[PDB]
Symmetry: D2
Subunit: 347 residues, 4 copies
């Protein structure tokens, strides 16, 4: 079968012809119908996930097939698979754990000490077929097709968990930084569908500010034309927001938005490539604010985003379909910031 | 009556002879039997609480009587007081709110937008009598005497809340920084009485390391004679601790202990005078750690520490009693780090 | 001023001409613009709240002015009122506590040991003016008028809290019993605005089933034309629902709906006049289900429903306005089940 | 190997000579060093778990080897086992799930839709060796020996979870019914080690009342010599207790103890063989009490009880060791209420 893989850090991804794996036990072989491509793949091409080296830190022995945003049809099942049949269309949760470590035992499998992350340190969906280590990491698709579901396994689950980490309720206000981008509009949609909180979206280009409003933001701010902090203080009557979801954590956002927090406010950091946070510790104590990290999501987060999406309560991302052979090009587009919409490869 | 007050920032506290207030409505007049003195008073003498100026930022019109650690006997009650009688011995919660703002409505009265903090921006216990704005902020003492109870209204409630913010359970491990000091041993005692968590205490002098062990720490580390990070990694089998209660937040502690955190670990900051936190944002995201502030406590925190102390489940601080006239001297002792034990003034 | 009051249990409510109270301290005098009338008043006329006798059990000394659903304009304020002015239009939270008891200290003021419930054991809004014991129990109205806001102080807060007690999230399904009635459609609206959960509504008349659907239910069941349990098992794929909000707790509902619960399901009981629950204890243990009571709401619940309503996130109840003199008639209508929509008196 | 099994409901357990299983994949073969026997086995001999028939309702095809309280040494491991070696002494969590259903995905594996309960519907420890389906369900023993650890996998985990369901904190009081029995003293010990709550223990014989006190109860009541309700009202100053852990749920306990609950009190039911609960629904609503079931425990509960026990924070049950051949006799002892201490079989 065809597979686009990282063969050498410093070279582009390479198309190889390799054998189709045979699933055993609880494994499932999926015939890929959609392989999402996101900014994380710009770094995977460089052999990094966050600051982590996939070879040195995650134990990867190259080559590895990329593609952590997976949906497709069941091709074959191992003899211990229960509850699924050949032909079923499913989305896959790639953030898998092994079961024995502390994090797995308490239900936070994505923080597993020996992770099994498909498309990151295990072979992924940039191929005609892909092995899912255990059938429990799937979700049958009824309303969505593969292209609509694939991006949700990464962007959907990530923002779903970040909204949960924001600990919202109707008495509160949420600020989403970069609310008009793909990730930002997904966060706005989820917050509007699940919390009852007042949602403020901020961005810097007019199109983006409009997309945030289309996504459901109650208030939107164009940081290029208005002082964001002053607008936030006006909207919240000087209280500040009870949570910020910062999808960037750049020198730029970290130097402004933490100032928008209300007492006990939660600053949820979702970016994997940003700056250092510099903040006066005594002010964190006096205001009881919290700086909290959020990474992808666990099985419960996966079930939640899939259930929302399958019920039509949040809408799929804007996508552009491409061929498996254009994988390098898709990643190039993200590097050069020329990508419009979420790119999805169709093998 | 006699009252020691801040009359001019830059001068020592001044003893004045002023009228005894007459309580009305829900107010209670207390005849002071114990007025605790803590490091916060070294700053109050300078007109500051944390980085806040009590005049500019809190609205104080000097002079103001200090003393936020209060216990004594009820002298007189206003006509709306219910459930207490003249002669009752009580401890007082000084971190009072007004009721209408967001924080009061959700039960976090200490974060009130227009706080009524006795001994800080309202007259306190460095006097023969003190007015308690509402009787609901008291707790009748049965087992403890005033001197034993007074420090708990500040140090006890502060560490009780910090232990709550650490979100401990038996599957977890807590690290208390500065575990041998007065605040540190109180935190160790509370954690041992209320969480079931494994408790690691760290300090830098041999006496302190021993006091932490007496307080109940399961493991204690002398940071002067051992590498604290290596010991923590050994004790936790490389996982790191699920929470750190840092009672200092100095350049010193902030540069070491956040490294001891396990994934999803909570770094609880309780210090009001420290440095800046500098931490790589992407590492907060990848590990899902949290930096969280904790300040004094709310009514529920007050009820909890008082209930634990009145049941003998935690022990009173080591104290040294002094006269109301020695207030300046007591504060001098804390400035010069010559104070042994918690100083308590007896009018 | 005119006031309609309970003067003798066994007689209809009596119109009296009494003095206008003068507010002092934190009290506020409100000029009533809307006084909601609900089924609770059918029982108040009989001197009962639930099975409680307001005289014997709550300490009421007759006569008492009814009306616990209050909105109006500030007429006068006591000298300690802050943050409100004469002329402000506000809704009032009538479920007030005194501050000192356990329940008040932990922020559950409605469960106060010595409650101050306006319209129940304290004079209410069936009069030209009404005293609010403390200004913190109000909410300024901007988007809603008094008639739209008044019912929310009882029906809105009650269902808002019941939805919270149901502990919903997007992975779950909620069943609302009696989903087409005034209370039922309010519960459906709140659940749809704040949880992300799949919502099933059940009722027994065609109009009601339609109103539940208009309210936002994802699935609605006509219990008269379909087997509710079989439909629930079909919709939930045999799992059952994760929560039921039972607004009646009649012999009828209690004998059917607890059977619809999934393992760990929460059966939230909101009715004040129902039957006995009879359930095999071993089945509660084996399935980990929970039977949980929910009564009116606390300050946080009041803030939440008011914020949702003021943001247009839930819609006001269908109302019918009437004169203060028609109070007895309004209650008669509820007794005879002839009331259409929520009746609101306008003094 | 020797194995004592249920071969026919209506006959005593039968000793058979069967093959030793060979573990594959993540399975582990354990050489049994301790097989606890509890009241649940009196019912297993009758083919029942609670009211469930293990054949009709759980799908068991007889014969099945009993023994759900397991500790022993690793004999052999399948090729996917990581983190354990031959010879390691471990306790096993028998309440296993399959991974795909709702309950498994949210971390409540014991409520799995297709449970794998060792000693109940899967072969257990009443044999020389036993297969553990996945290595993640074990805990290495360092401080405890097999006989001390085995009972904890059932009684320890059950009471640990019930204490968690009681939602205790230092501001609250817990009542443990039957506090002097094996299960009762374990509940008292756990509550004392993990909550900070005031603990009241009640029982009916003098020895039992004393054992409850030895276990750590702050207050103990002899229901045979004192009115339990009056004593509870005295101790709690008329408030009632915030939680009751009822280990029986008999007509007897259910008719008395729910009356001891304070408003918002949680009545935690742990018994598998009791009566029907009959309670006036309007009183549940008015007081916001909760009746909540608790069954065995999940992976997080297992980790917690094992960590407490391995740290010496709770003590092992009083045990009496016996031979595998005396299994029927051990169960007879429990039937005739002649068993003193927890019986543990040693193959
Ligand atoms: Zn992605
Ligand atoms: Zn793991
Ligand atoms: Zn202090
Ligand atoms: Zn306030
Ligand atoms: Zn009402
Ligand atoms: Zn109260
Ligand atoms: Zn057992
Ligand atoms: Zn399962």
């Amino acid at each position: 079968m065809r597979a686009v893989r990282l063969v050498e850090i410093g070279k582009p991804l390479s198309l190889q012809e390799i054998g189709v794996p045979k699933p055993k036990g609880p494994q499932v072989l999926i015939k890929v119908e959609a392989a999402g491509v996101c900014h994380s793949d710009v770094h995977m091409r460089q052999g990094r996930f966050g600051n982590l080296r996939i070879v040195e830190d995650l134990g990867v022995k190259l080559p590895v097939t990329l593609g952590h945003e997976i949906a497709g049809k069941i091709e074959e099942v191992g003899d211990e698979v229960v509850g699924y049949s050949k032909g079923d269309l499913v989305a896959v949760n790639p953030w898998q754990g092994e079961g024995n470590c502390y994090y797995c035992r308490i239900g936070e499998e994505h923080l597993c000490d020996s992770p099994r992350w498909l498309g990151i340190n295990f072979d992924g969906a940039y191929a005609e077929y892909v092995i899912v280590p255990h059938y429990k990491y799937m979700y049958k698709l009824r309303r969505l097709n593969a292209v609509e579901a694939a991006p949700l396994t990464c962007s959907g689950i990530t923002t779903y968990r970040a909204v949960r980490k924001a600990s919202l309720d109707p008495t509160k206000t949420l600020l989403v930084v970069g609310a008009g981008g793909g990730l930002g509009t997904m966060a706005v949609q989820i917050a509007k569908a699940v919390s009852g909180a007042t949602i403020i979206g901020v961005d810097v280009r007019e199109e983006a500010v409009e997309a945030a409003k289309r996504a459901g933001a109650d208030y939107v701010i164009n940081a290029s034309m208005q002082d964001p902090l002053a607008e936030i203080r006006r909207i919240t009557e000087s209280k500040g927001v009870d949570a910020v979801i910062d999808l960037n954590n750049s020198e730029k956002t970290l130097s402004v938005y933490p100032k928008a927090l209300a007492k006990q406010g939660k600053y949820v950091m979702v970016g994997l490539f940003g700056a250092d946070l510099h903040y006066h510790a005594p002010l964190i104590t006096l205001s009881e604010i919290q700086f909290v990290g959020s990474l992808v999501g666990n099985q419960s987060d996966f079930l939640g985003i899939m259930r929302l999406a399958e019920a039509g309560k949040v809408k799929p991302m804007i996508t552009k379909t491409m061929k498996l052979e254009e994988a390098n090009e898709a990643i190039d587009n993200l590097e050069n910031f020329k990508a419009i919409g979420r790119q999805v490869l169709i093998p």
